Design a protein around this ligand. Sequence first.
Ligand SMILES: CCCCCCCCO[C@@H]1O[C@H](CO)[C@@H](O)[C@H](O)[C@H]1O
Ligand SMILES: [Cl-]
Ligand SMILES: [Cl-]
Ligand SMILES: [Cl-]
Ligand SMILES: [Co+2]
Length: 297
Amino acid sequence: QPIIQFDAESWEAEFTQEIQDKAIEGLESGSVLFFPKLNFPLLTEELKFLDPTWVSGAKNISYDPRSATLKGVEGKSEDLRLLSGLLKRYAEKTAAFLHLLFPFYGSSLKIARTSFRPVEISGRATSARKDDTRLHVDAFPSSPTGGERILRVFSNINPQGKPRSWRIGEPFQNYLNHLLPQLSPPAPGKRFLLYLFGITKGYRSLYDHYMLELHDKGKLDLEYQKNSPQVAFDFPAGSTWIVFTDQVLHAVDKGQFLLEQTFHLKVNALKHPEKSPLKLLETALNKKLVSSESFKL
Ligand SMILES: CCCCCCCCO[C@@H]1O[C@H](CO)[C@@H](O)[C@H](O)[C@H]1O
Ligand SMILES: [Cl-]
Ligand SMILES: [Cl-]
Ligand SMILES: [Cl-]
Ligand SMILES: [Co+2]
């Protein structure tokens, strides 16, 4: 069941326990939670930001809600104030919604960076590694997770009714199994040098090493990209969806104007930790893949 649909229409909706159970079971099973009527409206004075010229450099426009800091865009203070207010409002609304929907996670949800993506996808072109028309789970070479989950909320805010076209692939366990013959341990000392030289933010755990290998090798596996099970779905303008993007194989084919919020969640806060990429990888390789793991018993 790759996509599970929900009726909630408001960022302040309250949920029955039955819907909460449907959401957490589906999320942790690697389904996309889809909210077709959950629109994120913009203020009239924000409509000018529906314009790709606001991206000033090679990075995405991003906002850190913890520090209230906006990056990746230049301009007058008043325009940066307005754009910060837009992304802050998305951080607030998505965080409130997740706390209404997932009480089981309690205060273990840790908000990370908000992003605004005004560039049309179908004109993009990058290296094969960075090409997100290729199915992948999320792993970022400069930003190891240490095993923590990457939970993302997406809202299509296209003002011309254009959908955002995704493809959703097969379960993580099958992807891992497909690529397992291709996995290899890191060269000794290499990750230590990446840390010492400032290439990585923190030390890249073995978990992060293997998630990057899965990400990169899966993108280079052209037969797998072509033939693996996958469904194409158009997320309509004015819809919202929620995904563990480190677990759900996904690719983005076209669309323009997206708000995105990243949260992190420790594995031991999950209802079924054994379903996490970390635990599936530790099982498949029979080893501890994050050295800072808490010790039980
Ligand atoms: C609409 C404004 C947002 C409301 C914030 C979510 C309210 C949280 O709701 C609470 O979450 C707790 C977990 O931390 C649970 O222990 C409680 O049972 C639950 O009532
Ligand atoms: Cl990176
Ligand atoms: Cl090392
Ligand atoms: Cl996307
Ligand atoms: Co991705």
